[PDB]
Amino acid sequence: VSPSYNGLGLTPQMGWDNWNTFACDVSEQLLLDTADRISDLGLKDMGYKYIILDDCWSSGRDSDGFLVADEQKFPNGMGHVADHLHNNSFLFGMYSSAGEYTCAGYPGSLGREEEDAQFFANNRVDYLKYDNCYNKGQFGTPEISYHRYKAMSDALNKTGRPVFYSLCNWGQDLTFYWGSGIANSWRMSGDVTAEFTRPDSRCPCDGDEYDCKYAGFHCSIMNILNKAAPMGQNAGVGGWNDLDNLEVGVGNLTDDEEKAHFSMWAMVKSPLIIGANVNNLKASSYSIYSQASVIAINQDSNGIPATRVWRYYVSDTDEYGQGEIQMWSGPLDNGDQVVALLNGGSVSRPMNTTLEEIFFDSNLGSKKLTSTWDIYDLWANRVDNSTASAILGRNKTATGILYNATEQSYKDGLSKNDTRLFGQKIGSLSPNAILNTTVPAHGIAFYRLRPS
């Protein structure tokens, strides 16, 4: 454990990034309309407060060497976008790359950290996503990558404006080891894609290669989760592993895959940044994003990512030859435990565990193993497709339906035993008894255990 380096990231950040769905075709108008939508839908007040502008926003540099925002896309400048966002109680993110160019070929910040940090401060930016394209040979060992990333960290600090600092170097040179002292989160892999399991030749490292020499992209949800599994021990208050933006409401993932994806990103204390087009967001994907109970896990005070207890390969493999089952378990701040039974097989199956596996670090005869625990389904009381479609078509308000974390923080709601945050009691687990369920294909059983 260590204090946060800058006082931010006390829990993993939440928000939205305009990329996964809009590429270089961004404007003040897109960004603010979408911002309005996220507020209207009650997602802002759930915690999704960072509106992150991604690549392709700039037009080059002025005569003083200073970044210039594209005047066609942003006729009032960035500072003006910031103010609008702040006036609707949003936080504002921007993007650059620790290299000569950004990934899409725009001006990068390598060797221009001071001016560029100053640009972000002058434009009242609250958050920086900091990429790793065209890094000019400045990678290959922990030391050289750390110093390249420390250079922007220090330059942001020098501006005296608080900036949440988000590393995007894909776990290159063992980022989990060095990120915390200079940054609030770090991408620990190549880009995610809307595929639950699919191996891809553009993502050459498999789920077991957490230390990868070619991060790539188009990595599956499970490839990324698998790489992240040993890394939980290097995350914590102030500095989080980042498993990349959520693909919920993007492409063609099933409701089960989307739930597993969301539940798992939450449990390992990843940032929850929406990759969906929230103006073309479908009903089922919306109610996944807005599941307060699950966000409560992510936003646990003094957050500890959960541990993979076990992993087995099954014969029920999918069209891509993939098929495994996993159990994860982790402690929660109020003494509760989160448990996940994850069915990455291609068929529905019975899944099972015991108290000895759940409290994998408790001794025989300890109180945890000797006591009874009520089981709470974290997926109960999810917003039905009807209500969600209503809200999405502006026929019903989100107010009084969605949990309002701005009004009541996750910590305080948890203290007040707030039903919206614990799911639904479905049973109890005694010593020497098994916990059984049937878990859908590419799905999840996701529980919170509380003492009886």
Add this chain to the structure above:
Amino acid sequence: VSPSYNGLGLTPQMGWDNWNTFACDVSEQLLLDTADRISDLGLKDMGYKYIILDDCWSSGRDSDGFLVADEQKFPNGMGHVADHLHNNSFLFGMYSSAGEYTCAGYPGSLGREEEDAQFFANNRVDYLKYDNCYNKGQFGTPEISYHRYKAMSDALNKTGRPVFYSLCNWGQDLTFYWGSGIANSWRMSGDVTAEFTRPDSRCPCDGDEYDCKYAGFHCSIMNILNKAAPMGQNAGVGGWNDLDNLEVGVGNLTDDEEKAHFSMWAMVKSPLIIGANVNNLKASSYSIYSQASVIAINQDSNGIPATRVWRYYVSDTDEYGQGEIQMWSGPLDNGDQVVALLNGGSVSRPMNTTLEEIFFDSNLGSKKLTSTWDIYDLWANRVDNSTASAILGRNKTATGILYNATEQSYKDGLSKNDTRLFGQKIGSLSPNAILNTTVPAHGIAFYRLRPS
């Protein structure tokens, strides 16, 4: 994406290198006779404009430390060879090594970059192949290799003469990551050899070891293609992965192996440098080199290397225990798609795919997956063995037979719907239907899909 670093390599380079067939036994006369031949055969005007002189050309250094060309082999000097080439509208390549010696033991350029760059400029050289033999311990991490290669890059730039810069360090220290900002292409492996699949003990890294510590040589065509597969995402306008000179018309590859080799080098946007002895070039190998349709893929404006969609091992293995099948697919600038079904098995087989696999990045219900696509065989209208033998024996001209890209660029020919560049329509592919063919052993089915 990033701009070209020097304005060259807007498409992968094409030409000829005198090595694969002539070793140290080079002269002004060999080089110019061969040059004449490449022009006469219509290959120059197809795009094969770089005549690259390789190792063993020098005799040492003069009293000022300056490279001295062998006076027996080049009695008029290199500048004189350059002028002759330029007067027949050719471009001129030379060779050195980023080390103390070249691979064949001639003077290398390490620490002598300024003088040596100046030598190339003074002799009006247009292209440099820059090797990695005897590098004096200056390798082992990305940073140290990058700086060694940047040293020649900067020295070439300082001369003010445009020089296409071709790295030859065999992918050592992850060249795909750092090449583009200092160079126009980079060898991503040990030397190729005229063997389609054959594992070799002098090439210890298998096709899956893209990050290799001992690049070696005598690597098979498939070993090299396999290593190159994840790397396409780091290639693009201005900076290309180099899979080494073509072995078409060299050794004893079959017509099928030669077609697969050529089609695959094209599709991943490798340079197409002829390794053949063009004065002892056989009929079938000639018509492979001169297939305009396939070169059109390589010379696509705003080039994107294709992606390996899938790869499976088969039981139909060859004399060396090798046998796999692959599907590759990639977008083309005008909206078309290139598709390859590659049969590395030892027996002819039926091969098949669908629109969902071809447009592997398109969503269900998108227009691409919802529309019909005409299939064009990129191997149709290939110059028959008769016509090719005629041309080769100086009994028929190439004029009016071969596509003349000097007269009409590949881009413009593609715009004009020029039949010579699209192959032959053979069918159409509808939603929910399969695309089937029979693909020869160690062969390829190579298509261009256009919207109906």
Add this chain to the structure above:
Amino acid sequence: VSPSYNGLGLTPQMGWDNWNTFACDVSEQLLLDTADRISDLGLKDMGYKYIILDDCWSSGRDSDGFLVADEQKFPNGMGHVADHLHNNSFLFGMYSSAGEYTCAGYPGSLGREEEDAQFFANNRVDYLKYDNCYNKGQFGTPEISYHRYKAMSDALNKTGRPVFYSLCNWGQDLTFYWGSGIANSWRMSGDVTAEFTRPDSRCPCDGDEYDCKYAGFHCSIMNILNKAAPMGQNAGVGGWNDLDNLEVGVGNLTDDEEKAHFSMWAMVKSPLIIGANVNNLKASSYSIYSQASVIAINQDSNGIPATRVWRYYVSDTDEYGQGEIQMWSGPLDNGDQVVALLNGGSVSRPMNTTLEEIFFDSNLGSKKLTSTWDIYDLWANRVDNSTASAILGRNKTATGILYNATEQSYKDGLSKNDTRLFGQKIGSLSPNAILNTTVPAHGIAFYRLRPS
């Protein structure tokens, strides 16, 4: 071989560390009560002389930048704890980390080595455990880790007070290669845990990955032993591989697992630091710790770690899929040999070897292979559960029961043929004959061979 760098560590150190059982909840009173206990139980005079205070002891830094011990936990300061310990003939250990923070987030010593070394000297500290948390990017290659650790080594030396120097960097960057010239021992892995075999996702490197990029923790006893196996050749007088504190009397290991664990740590010349709560130490675990015969192996003058002769996987696997059998053998200073037959299978089994396997480096026809050897059981005459429970409840003294190594060193006791140190003769082994026994599940047969 090399001299000890500082004159210490002539044999592996022994003692106790307050962590495995007490975490941050430490005080002068805990530490001294426990110290009293270790003396009373006769363990001190067996060799367990280092009382090591671990993380969480400090409260920050004073106005001069100097470490400040927590005044609530240590109202008299550390120097006062030291004096008490020294007055009962104990040695005193403290802890820091070669990073910005300690693992539990207290002040670390990186860049503060001189002051911090001086703090330890001023407080009369005899031993330093030096961790690797929050090392600020200063790892990744042997050179950078060596210099970071050399910095504290030199600063300790500069104080002129002898300090036993114990590296805790988990074998990162091949510590076995560079530790000896700057240190007396080095952790060669992630943290141990009270699990004999259990794979854990927080310890991603398996037993075969001695060169690990993510040491982690919760590694099994066998995972750690397996990683240590090639490393014995880089240990010796003055500088020892450290396989982490003993889990004997911690969690729920069986008596067999505890014996194997203890016997194996001894044989490879690891430090024997008690991880147990000695005030809540059970009878069986106590008599394992106090087995003089086995400690005699660890404390062999001119110590050579034993060699793994063979390793095989068995079908008798445990609940975690683990199951292997091993034979280890090593020379002893007086010409004797230590032999271990280790049953990591889940079932009791017959185990067997010969003289040719025991003297794996002796030639055919040599005297060793030609002679007869008496077999001594190193586990005979172990303190029975009754006597141990008596001593533990303060109903019987340890005096005259336990070997007193303060009175008679292990070397001198070995010379005097002292029965307490050789175990019990159980037979003899002749040329061309097999040595057979039945070895319990997760257990060990542990012998000393002496010439007939």
Add this chain to the structure above:
Amino acid sequence: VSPSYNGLGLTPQMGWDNWNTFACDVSEQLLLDTADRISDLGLKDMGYKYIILDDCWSSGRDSDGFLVADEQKFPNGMGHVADHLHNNSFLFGMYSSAGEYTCAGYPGSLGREEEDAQFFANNRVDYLKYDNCYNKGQFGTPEISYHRYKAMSDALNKTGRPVFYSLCNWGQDLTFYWGSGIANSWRMSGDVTAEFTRPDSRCPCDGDEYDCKYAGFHCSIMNILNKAAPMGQNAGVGGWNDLDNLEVGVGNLTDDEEKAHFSMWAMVKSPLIIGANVNNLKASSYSIYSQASVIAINQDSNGIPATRVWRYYVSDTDEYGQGEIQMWSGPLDNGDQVVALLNGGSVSRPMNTTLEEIFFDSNLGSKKLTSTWDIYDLWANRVDNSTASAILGRNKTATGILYNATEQSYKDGLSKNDTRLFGQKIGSLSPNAILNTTVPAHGIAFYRLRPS
């Protein structure tokens, strides 16, 4: 190819090292008696001219920092040993380590290169074996190891006395890549041992791990040969891979294993340094060492190590689970070819090949594949056990029996068609015909092919 860096090592060196059989128990008298023996036995005049004194020769340093030879072991100093050796036409080798200590703990040369080089020059030393123990963190990347080794290289050069420079860093940090420009040979692995195949836990890298992080020792003959296999392409005139001293006449290898070992070290152009106790050398081992025909392969002018053509695992495995078969083939300077069929299986087997496999780099229809080749057995006319025992007991002279390479160099003897150097013609190999033999367990068929 590159010139020799210092003009030496035009062929691999030959000689004797006093270690494998005498450890630290060395003297002027041992060394000179043994020297006398090597001359008397005719081995000197065969090429075994370097008498290499190994570790444990020094007693520390004098008041000027200068190495001091042990006055008990060398009462006249080293220079006096040198002169004696030179007066019997021998060359003289000494030893140090690129570290703080030598492997046996004597003074090392790290940071003391100038004085120590000067010591070797002052004592008229002709050869240096330069180890890698206690290198103080100065390893881990090619660059850092190269510079450490270059430091002694330059210091030797500065003395102006020719010194054959032999690196002993066990292939650490890819020595094959950088050795040639600073040295005449380089150990490419951990120490050999008298075991043909035996895996050992002190040698964790298997035969496929040529790039090893823990070289270790007690590596088998086949483990070392396997690691060396890709490396032949980086050896050549002036700079050789070193597979460690010969174990012929050491331990208990069979006559077949000894022949295979010797034949294979020769074929890959390793140094041939005798590890045997030549005063306790058995008859069969002697006639292996003195096989002129095989040494002729090693001492080929313009030496090219042979290539492994193929390798297969067999079911006929030994007591250690090992069993493979290999074919090697390489060109010789006079146009001949060396072929080896190696039976690492546990049983005698038929072995076979063709001309297409022998001339693995020749095209179909080339002259090599189209011609007939006489097969010569390189093991014929070996000195029978009787004659060898006679010579060894000083009952018969070696003169007129052994080839005298001092009188007639291997090159010149090869030119003169000297029967002693080509073995015995046993047949001929035609196109489209197979070459068959039966090869003993752990043995070799070792041929020279000459054009008919």
